[PDB]
């Protein structure tokens, strides 16, 4: 976009989302917390979207997520809801 075609103080939300997290007008992370539930257990656990550790449900002792390079990969059975 040409510089005079945009406002530096009122950038469109799409551009702000597309920008690097630190290069936005105000820094904001791309991570979030989620409520993950096992397939069979009613217990509900909070997990970081980019967890570096293998989160295990206390009740059934089952691994909910696996650390990766970026976002943690959840187990096939489990499902998540964005918490925020």
Site for other proteins, rule CB under 8 A: 1-5, 7-9, 13, 21-22, 25-30, 33, 45-48, 51-53, 55, 83-84
Compute the distance between CA of residue 27 and CA of residue 11 in angstroms, rounded to an integer.
14
Shorter beta-carbon distance to other proteins: residue 32 or 39: 32
Shorter beta-carbon distance to other proteins: residue 26 or 42: 26
CB of 24 to other proteins, least distance (A): 8
- Which phi and psi (to 5°) does residue 16 adopt? -60, -40
CB of 56 to other proteins, least distance (A): 9
Task: Go through the chain and tell me how many residues it has.
Answer: 84
CB of 13 to other proteins, least distance (A): 7
Compute the distance between CA of residue 52 and CA of residue 58 in angstroms, rounded to an integer.
18
8-state DSSP, 12? -
């Amino acid at each position: 976009t040409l510089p005079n075609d945009v406002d530096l103080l009122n950038p469109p939300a799409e551009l702000e989302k597309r920008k690097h997290k630190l290069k936005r007008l105000v820094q904001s992370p791309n991570s979030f917390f989620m409520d993950v539930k096992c397939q069979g257990c009613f217990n509900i656990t909070t997990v970081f979207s980019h967890s570096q550790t293998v989160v295990v449900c206390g009740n059934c002792q089952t691994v909910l997520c696996q650390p990766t390079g970026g976002r943690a990969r959840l187990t096939e059975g489990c499902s998540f809801r964005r918490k925020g």
